[PDB]
């Protein structure tokens, strides 16, 4: 059993996990929307999630990712570092998933449902002690690409979508 969009022949061209992970090195990615409220690491009613990477390791298809996030337990922005590795899921031959590993050794494996140059639609299977659902990540939290947004809305149909990282996360400007 696997999601109907998890068809490598049909959709693999837009499910390149390693390319998507390496993209975190040049630009910060913001999780702009999701269909679930709680994450074991980011917290409850989490918002303002962003990520940037460094230390690309081609041999391992891994990066060291630095995250920022907020939740209802603290008014201040929170930060964490996790290793993320491009791995295979759903029988794919080319890596289509992200294996996150926290400093405490906790592992989460999420799957790229759709990805374009500056945005990703990610599926959380819900088997890592977490809620099953979808996430939408983009490099510009104010200008969301239509292709990814449409794919996110298509795959996430029947759920409750909510904003995660928005301009409300920051107090921009001066005086
Ligand atoms: N471009 C990939 C965005 C992301 C989500 N999780 C880790 N990185
Ligand atoms: N779906 C996000 C799981 C995760 C990875 N790191 C922290 N939380």
Swiss-Prot record:
This is Female-specific histamine-binding protein 2. InterPro entries: Calycin, Tick_his-bd. GO terms for cellular component: extracellular region. It holds the Pfam family His_binding. Keywords: Disulfide bond, Secreted, Signal. It is found in: Secreted. Coiled coil: none annotated. Monomer. Its main location: secreted. It comes from the Eukaryota. Disulfide bonds join 48-169, 119-148. Expressed in salivary glands. Histamine 2 binds at residues 20, 24, 98, 100, 120, 137. The keyword Nucleotidyltransferase does not apply. It comes from Rhipicephalus appendiculatus (Brown ear tick). GO terms for molecular function: amine binding. Salivary tick protein that acts by scavenging histamine at the wound site, outcompeting histamine receptors for histamine, thereby overcoming host inflammatory responses. Binds histamine with a high-affinity (Kd=1.7 nM). Contains two binding histamine sites (H and L), that appear to bind histamine with differing affinities (high and low).
